[PDB]
Design a protein around this ligand. Structure first.
Ligand SMILES: COC(=O)C[C@](O)(CCCC(C)(C)O)C(=O)O[C@@H]1C(OC)=C[C@]23CCCN2CCc2cc4c(cc2[C@H]13)OCO4
Ligand SMILES: [Cl-]
Ligand SMILES: [Cl-]
Ligand SMILES: [Cl-]
Ligand SMILES: [Cl-]
Ligand SMILES: [Cl-]
Ligand SMILES: [Cl-]
Ligand SMILES: [Cl-]
Ligand SMILES: [K+]
Ligand SMILES: [Mg+2]
Ligand SMILES: [Mg+2]
Ligand SMILES: [Mg+2]
Ligand SMILES: [Mg+2]
Ligand SMILES: [Mg+2]
Ligand SMILES: [Mg+2]
Ligand SMILES: [Mg+2]
Ligand SMILES: [Mg+2]
Ligand SMILES: [Mg+2]
Ligand SMILES: [Mg+2]
Ligand SMILES: [Mg+2]
Ligand SMILES: [Mg+2]
Ligand SMILES: [Mg+2]
Ligand SMILES: [Mg+2]
Ligand SMILES: [Mg+2]
Ligand SMILES: [Mg+2]
Ligand SMILES: [Mg+2]
Ligand SMILES: [Mg+2]
Ligand SMILES: [Mg+2]
Ligand SMILES: [Mg+2]
Ligand SMILES: [Mg+2]
Ligand code: NA
Ligand code: NA
Ligand code: NA
Ligand code: NA
Ligand code: NA
Ligand code: NA
Ligand code: NA
Ligand code: NA
Ligand code: NA
Ligand code: NA
Ligand code: NA
Ligand code: NA
Ligand code: NA
Ligand code: NA
Ligand code: NA
Ligand code: NA
Ligand code: NA
Ligand code: NA
Ligand code: NA
Ligand code: NA
Ligand code: NA
Ligand code: NA
Ligand code: NA
Ligand code: NA
Ligand code: NA
Ligand SMILES: [Sr+2]
Ligand SMILES: [Sr+2]
Ligand SMILES: [Sr+2]
Ligand SMILES: [Sr+2]
Ligand SMILES: [Sr+2]
Ligand SMILES: [Sr+2]
Ligand SMILES: [Sr+2]
Ligand SMILES: [Sr+2]
Ligand SMILES: [Sr+2]
Ligand SMILES: [Sr+2]
Ligand SMILES: [Sr+2]
Ligand SMILES: [Sr+2]
Ligand SMILES: [Sr+2]
Ligand SMILES: [Sr+2]
Ligand SMILES: [Sr+2]
Ligand SMILES: [Sr+2]
Ligand SMILES: [Sr+2]
Ligand SMILES: [Sr+2]
Ligand SMILES: [Sr+2]
Ligand SMILES: [Sr+2]
Ligand SMILES: [Sr+2]
Ligand SMILES: [Sr+2]
Ligand SMILES: [Sr+2]
Ligand SMILES: [Sr+2]
Ligand SMILES: [Sr+2]
Ligand SMILES: [Sr+2]
Ligand SMILES: [Sr+2]
Lengths: 160, 142, 172, 337
RNA sequence: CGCCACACGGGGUAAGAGCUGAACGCAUCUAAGCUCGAAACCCACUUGGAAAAGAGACACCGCCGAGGUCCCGCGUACAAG
RNA sequence: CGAGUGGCUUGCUACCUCGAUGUCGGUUCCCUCCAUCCUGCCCGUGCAGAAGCGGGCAAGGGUGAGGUUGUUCGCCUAUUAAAGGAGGUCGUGAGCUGGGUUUAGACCGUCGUGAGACAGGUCGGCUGCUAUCUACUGGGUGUGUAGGUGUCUGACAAGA
RNA sequence: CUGUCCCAACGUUGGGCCCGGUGAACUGUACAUUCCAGUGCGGAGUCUGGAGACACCCAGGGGGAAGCGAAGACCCUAUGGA
RNA sequence: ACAGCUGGUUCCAAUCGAAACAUGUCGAAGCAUGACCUCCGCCGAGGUAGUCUGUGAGGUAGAGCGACCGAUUGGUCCUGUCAAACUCCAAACUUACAGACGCUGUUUGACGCGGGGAUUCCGGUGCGCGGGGUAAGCCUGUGUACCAGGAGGGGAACAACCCAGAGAUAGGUUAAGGUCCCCAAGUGUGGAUUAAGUGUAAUCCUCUGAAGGUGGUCUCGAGCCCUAGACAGCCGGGAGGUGAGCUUAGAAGCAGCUACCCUCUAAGAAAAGCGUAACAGCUUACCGGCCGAGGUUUGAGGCGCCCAAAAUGAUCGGGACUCAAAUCCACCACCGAGACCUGUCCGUACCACUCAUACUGGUAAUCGAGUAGAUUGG
């Protein structure tokens, strides 16, 4: 199904699992990547992926953008490299689909999406100075797999 | 044939639509206008898109017809007609008292109207009316 | 901006409207240099290329006009020479200058002669396997040279195996 | 998905209406090459016979062998170039300037024209030369007529007047060549313009068929099978789609067929002669007997017998001229039988 | 169902191949400029076209007479015209 | 995974017409679109050549005959440069056809107590009208330009 | 076996066309020379913008007037009928 | 015959002016009762469409959750997220009553009460907030204004978008919108951007244009380098110990492993990239010369470009427009309604005089559009 059906915040917040049954599991395998034993303050460089438009990003898009981002970091910095990436948004919004015409139209549960407001950090990676251009490329691949245009903003790093 | 014109306009190196707008205004005020050197009249912009518009106007038509002129003689005359209510009595009289010419059939030199002239030293993206007509397929008789 | 170009002693150049004529011992070259708000004039012993605007587009052309005039200076004195070599593998290629055009016969076994016309006052001299395209106008010489290489263009078959043709050896 | 098929008939010979002049009018003339000369002639269609000929084509496997070729016999007696018209280059195209006429006229030319009694051939010639000096002279053409009186099979005596161009050398030399033809009496023959073996373009006004339906006029199908018995035999399916809500002029409809001007290209002149050599036994059907100046055109020619056909040197030939073909035999067998 | 005829070539382009060339000393097919380059576009060729309201041009004849219509014998024409 | 374009399929809606805008398929005749099957010119190649594969420009022309089936679709055969797709009220019944859908007769299967039913199958089963306007194909009569004969010009127009 | 087809042709008779005589009907809110686009209750000769368009008449085959003919037989609705 | 269904129902004018909703109904194409419209009689001094303040009511937006609740990460306290049916918090705002100001009423009697007559119970659209649905010129709520039943001006045309609510006639000035022509008013002024005909399209079924990309161009900021010569280009040098060692038939910058050391010097790696079976060969680092002025890295903004395919004839309404007739920032002067101002007249209401509802005089900034319907004079 296209994202055109779910990308906008046009419906109420539908998260309450005590009233909703049959919710498909999240396709997101990991949320804490790289070296999850080390601290975020132990790194000199902190670069985040900032979403420019207020959207709803599905669990399938989150997994696709996370996979294409972390796979590049595993390719360039190694499987046990000196970095740590975080996906801070979780898919709370439960999604429906009306799949009888418009009669009894309340749709059955088909998926989950993450409500991300404009200006928010979806991804945040902490790396060293020499690995900074490899992570900007991981985010360049990650923004092509989500709905809005994005900013790759450097938060802690006057090393240029 | 003779045409006793009150005003004789020199279209040479002048922006067509601007001359046309003034010639229309004057014809409705009762003036007998004669546009001269229309082959040398100018129209600004990228040649490729200008010719594309004029080529489409030639290709457009059906049984009822869309008679679009290829010569600079008629192109300027049509440009003037679009600025005149030619279907109405007053408008037709104004239009019929305006004639466009290839070259200058008169002894008098035409007057260059204000704001119409184009400085060639300041512009490169423009076309001569005759250049449009040659591309349209008209026989160069000027 | 304003760029002044000192004219060589061998050369003397006149100008009318937008056209600049440059005469010398190797010939005469006339070129049209037209661009918005760029005035090219002859101030006795120097050629002046000036404009009131300093934008990227105007600057691009001022520098192009400079190189064109400096090339015309070189053309009417030392001239422009492009050297070419004719290579053949199986079929003996007959390159000859028949009139105001250079004809190539029996290329790759063809019965029909391939021919291109020489641009302007450009001279094509052939000494067996070597050809030298020469003249005052770089535009005319550069093209006539290129036209000869392009004349033996092959699109249908592999260029790596069928390498026959006249190629540019020396660029001035 | 319903098979494709080219449209019925050509749209380039329209509108399919009756011709204004029965005398054909060329819309194009040959290019100026060698020596000056009149760019055309005219005759009267006689009928058809066949000729046994020797193959002239150097690229044919049959070069030198006997080949039977169909031929249209056209009676081509001498014509009279009674005047020289000159055109000037105006910003509105070519406009006629002046005409230089003669004194010697044919006895029965007054059946068509109001023959000149008072004319100044010198002031006219002067006006044309002042225009040549000014660089305003366009082309030079001759006012020419036929002598149907010389043809016994054609009922008319009233001459067919037509304009013919003079092309060739320089504008100065062809002005002089033109004035020489005129000032004598205007008499010129087919030989003066054409040589046997050259390619000519024959123009003619076709055989009139009055009003005919789409099947004959445009070559549309007749209704097939079951559709042929329902009340519709020779009528087209529809006059067009629902939209556009009008009948397009491109749809095959009824009307005038025939009596249109056609200019048949690249016709080989097999022989140009004089006498009764191509005449058929019992005479040409609906025409008569030929005993005078003739031309033998390869194949068919537009128009019926007795009609005025026009000649012009081919403006677009495909083959190179193979002059004076060897005529082994000309059939004189009756066209009845 | 038989027979005859129905180009080539020019001009300007697309994709593309290039020349000269700067911004940006170099480089660069392009930004200005230029050489090429499609069955495609324009011309060439055929057909119509003085009702093109700027309603056209030329030559001769004529204004007490040029010419046309009717009439008559007929078709290279034609449903009336 | 993300972003779109189209308006050929399907679905949704119930805005328009129930004092009726004749339903599928086919046929015949005309115009068009390009997302190009062939043909022209090109770029790449895992481009030696030959034959291909992929891509670009391009709608001038072409894209055909047949066997089953009412079929559209599709399967199949032999040819072919190729035998492209789509829009025009799913173009076209005051043009045709009437094989299918979908009246009234009848049979079979299934369902029903029954009348009778079926988004099952099957045999049979109708096609109205003299064109007022408009549109176009061809043909005339007048008026305008402003006496006559003959010859032309060429704004435009059509072509594959 | 053959014109059902390829693929159409020519001919025959009666019409059709012109003339004398006889002489209806269907249909008609008005206006009306239209065409291309647009707009509008989303399927316009009449609205908007342009284009084209001198008037009248003859013959034609029927593209359009969502043509004429029949208060839709389908479908639903009616505290309708049989 | 009956029908809750379709059609039709004939003269003028003046005042007021809806409902397309609620409850019940074999009810949903209909009725009844309310709401709402109108008319009459009664009552007799208050009333409350706006605002402010005071005394109260509330849990929506937002926010947050070691504040409940239930969702929802990882690590050896820290770290990552959420809620229509969660709340430790919490608006704007809506709302009860009262006072004050405002407005209104006491001859135009308001507020209220009683009675007669209805019409109406298919609604629609814009905006705000919604719920369903991929969406819809979808379905279904809610507040509001409008169309319906609303003219006139503008918007190309176009119920509901903008101005505007309108007796007649007349003069004037503006509103929306517009001032190159068609077309009334500017080819207005100062300045900048754009080269695509971008654009000349407020809103929209209607006006598309996206993710992604862009040394197209303009503008602004930051760091670093530079006349002790920067960036680039071109010339010259790119040397020895030694062809490092290990590995290996061999490997000598450059198959692999490890080391990666010092001379000469102005530089020159235990070699950055090709190249060879291995050498050789070509250049990179680094140094010097020629040259001579800015250069280089990164950030932000403006307009444009690519992305961008459809059917009879292209389009901003058309013509056409390029230091604009585009776009952005300012500014100047005009054109332009029935609005507003103004003269006269008419109707209606009320006041004075009157028997009069006949004259006459006066008041209306706070009267003048209208479908269904009520009322009244002709
Ligand atoms: C169910 O199909 C039918 O009933 C066909 C017919 O009955 C045909 C009537 C033909 C007449 C008698 C009017 O000549 C009819 O009235 O059709 C309507 C009809 O009659 C005018 C036209 C309709 C109305 C919308 C357009 N459509 C075209 C024809 C049609 C075809 C249909 C259709 C409806 C229509 C309607 O159902 C599916 O197939
Ligand atoms: Cl047309
Ligand atoms: Cl008008
Ligand atoms: Cl320019
Ligand atoms: Cl048929
Ligand atoms: Cl009001
Ligand atoms: Cl434009
Ligand atoms: Cl009254
Ligand atoms: K209907
Ligand atoms: Mg090959
Ligand atoms: Mg015979
Ligand atoms: Mg015989
Ligand atoms: Mg119909
Ligand atoms: Mg394409
Ligand atoms: Mg086509
Ligand atoms: Mg259909
Ligand atoms: Mg039809
Ligand atoms: Mg029918
Ligand atoms: Mg009929
Ligand atoms: Mg059957
Ligand atoms: Mg059946
Ligand atoms: Mg009915
Ligand atoms: Mg029924
Ligand atoms: Mg019953
Ligand atoms: Mg009344
Ligand atoms: Mg009254
Ligand atoms: Mg919230
Ligand atoms: Mg209403
Ligand atoms: Mg004005
Ligand atoms: Mg545009
Ligand atoms: Na159901
Ligand atoms: Na233009
Ligand atoms: Na046209
Ligand atoms: Na019949
Ligand atoms: Na139809
Ligand atoms: Na060409
Ligand atoms: Na779409
Ligand atoms: Na059909
Ligand atoms: Na094509
Ligand atoms: Na089949
Ligand atoms: Na239909
Ligand atoms: Na039928
Ligand atoms: Na049908
Ligand atoms: Na038969
Ligand atoms: Na019709
Ligand atoms: Na009843
Ligand atoms: Na009800
Ligand atoms: Na009811
Ligand atoms: Na009060
Ligand atoms: Na909110
Ligand atoms: Na209701
Ligand atoms: Na209102
Ligand atoms: Na309006
Ligand atoms: Na535009
Ligand atoms: Na009323
Ligand atoms: Sr919603
Ligand atoms: Sr994106
Ligand atoms: Sr003016
Ligand atoms: Sr002629
Ligand atoms: Sr012609
Ligand atoms: Sr029949
Ligand atoms: Sr229509
Ligand atoms: Sr190019
Ligand atoms: Sr005339
Ligand atoms: Sr295209
Ligand atoms: Sr191809
Ligand atoms: Sr189908
Ligand atoms: Sr199938
Ligand atoms: Sr079709
Ligand atoms: Sr079936
Ligand atoms: Sr069935
Ligand atoms: Sr049947
Ligand atoms: Sr008149
Ligand atoms: Sr008929
Ligand atoms: Sr009935
Ligand atoms: Sr509320
Ligand atoms: Sr201005
Ligand atoms: Sr300005
Ligand atoms: Sr629409
Ligand atoms: Sr973009
Ligand atoms: Sr009133
Ligand atoms: Sr009123």
């Amino acid at each position: 199904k296209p994202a055109s059906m779910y990308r906008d915040i046009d419906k109420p917040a539908y998260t309450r699992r005590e009233y909703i049954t049959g919710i498909p599991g999240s396709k997101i395998a990991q949320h804490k990547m790289g070296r999850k034993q080390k601290d975020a303050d132990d790194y000199p460089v902190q670069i985040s992926l900032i979403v420019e438009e207020t959207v709803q990003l599905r669990h399938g898009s989150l997994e696709a953008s996370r996979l294409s981002a972390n796979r590049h970091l595993i390719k360039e910095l190694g499987e046990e490299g000196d970095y740590k990436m975080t996906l801070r948004k979780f898919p709370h919004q439960v999604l429906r689909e009306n799949k009888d015409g418009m009669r009894a139209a309340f749709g059955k549960i088909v998926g989950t999406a993450a409500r991300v407001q404009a200006g928010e950090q979806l991804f945040t990676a902490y790396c060293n100075v020499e690995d900074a251009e490899h992570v900007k490329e991981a985010f360049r691949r990650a923004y092509n797999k989500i709905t809005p245009s994005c900013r790759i903003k450097v938060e802690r790093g006057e090393e240029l | 044939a003779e045409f006793d014109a009150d005003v004789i306009v020199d279209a040479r190196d002048c922006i067509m639509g601007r001359v046309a707008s003034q010639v229309a205004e004057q014809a409705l005020d009762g003036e007998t206008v004669a546009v001269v050197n229309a082959e040398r009249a100018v129209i600004t912009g990228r040649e490729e898109q200008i010719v594309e518009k004029y080529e489409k106007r030639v290709d457009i038509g059906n049984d009822n017809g869309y008679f679009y002129p290829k010569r600079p003689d008629g192109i300027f005359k049509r440009t003037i007609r679009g600025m005149l209510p030619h279907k109405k009595q007053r408008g037709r009289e104004a239009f019929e008292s305006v004639r466009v010419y290839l070259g200058n059939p008169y002894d008098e030199d035409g007057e260059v109207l204000d704001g119409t002239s184009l400085d060639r030293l300041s512009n490169i993206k423009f076309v001569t009316l005759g250049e449009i007509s040659e591309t349209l397929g008209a026989n160069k008789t000027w | 901006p304003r760029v002044e170009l000192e004219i060589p002693e061998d050369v003397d150049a006149e100008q009318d409207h937008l056209d600049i004529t440059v005469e010398g011992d190797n010939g005469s070259v006339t070129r049209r240099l037209w661009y918005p708000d760029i005035d090219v004039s002859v101030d006795g012993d120097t050629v002046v290329i000036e404009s009131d605007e300093d934008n990227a587009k105007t600057m691009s052309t001022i520098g192009t006009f400079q190189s064109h005039i400096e090339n015309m200076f070189h053309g009417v004195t030392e001239g422009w020479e492009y050297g070419m070599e004719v290579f053949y593998s199986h079929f003996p290629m007959q390159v000859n200058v028949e009139g105001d055009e250079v004809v190539i016969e029996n290329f790759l076994g063809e019965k029909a002669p391939r021919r291109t016309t020489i641009h302007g006052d450009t001279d094509v001299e052939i000494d067996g396997e070597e050809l030298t395209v020469s003249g005052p106008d770089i535009e005319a010489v550069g093209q006539t040279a290129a036209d000869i290489e392009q004349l033996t263009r092959i699109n249908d078959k592999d260029v790596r195996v069928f390498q026959d043709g006249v190629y540019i050896t020396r660029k001035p | 998905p319903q098979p494709s098929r080219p449209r019925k008939g050509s749209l380039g010979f329209g509108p399919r209406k009756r011709s204004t002049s029965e005398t054909p009018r060329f819309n194009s003339w040959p290019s100026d090459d060698g020596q000056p000369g009149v760019q055309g002639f005219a005759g009267y269609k006689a009928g058809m016979t066949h000729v046994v000929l020797v193959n002239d084509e150097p690229n044919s496997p049959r070069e030198g062998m006997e080949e039977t070729v169909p031929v249209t016999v056209i009676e081509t007696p001498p014509m009279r170039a009674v005047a020289l018209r000159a055109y000037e280059d105006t910003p509105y195209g070519q406009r006629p300037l002046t005409e230089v006429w003669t004194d010697e006229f044919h006895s029965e030319l007054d059946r068509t024209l109001d023959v000149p009694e008072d004319h100044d051939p010198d002031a006219a010639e002067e006006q044309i030369r002042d225009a040549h000096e000014a660089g305003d002279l366009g082309d030079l053409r001759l006012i020419t007529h036929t002598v149907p009186d010389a043809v016994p099979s054609v009922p008319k005596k009233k001459p067919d007047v037509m304009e013919t161009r003079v092309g060739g050398g320089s504008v100065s030399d062809r002005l002089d060549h033109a004035l020489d033809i005129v000032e004598d009496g205007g008499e010129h023959a087919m030989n003066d313009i054409f040589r046997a073996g050259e390619y000519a373009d024959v123009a003619g006004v076709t055989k009139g068929k009055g009003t005919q339906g789409p099947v004959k006029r445009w070559g549309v199908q007749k209704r097939k099978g079951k559709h042929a018995r329902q009340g519709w035999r020779r009528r087209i399916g529809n006059l067009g789609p629902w939209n556009p809500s009008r009948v397009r002029s491109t749809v095959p409809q009824q009307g005038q067929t025939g009596y249109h001007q056609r200019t048949e290209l690249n016709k080989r002149l097999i022989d140009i002669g004089e006498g009764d050599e191509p005449t058929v036994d019992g005479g040409f059907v609906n025409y008569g007997e030929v005993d005078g100046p003739y031309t033998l055109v390869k194949g068919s020619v537009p128009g019926p017998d007795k009609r005025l056909v026009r000649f012009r040197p081919a403006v677009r030939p495909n083959d190179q001229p193979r002059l004076d073909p060897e005529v082994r035999y000309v059939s004189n067998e009756s066209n009845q039988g």
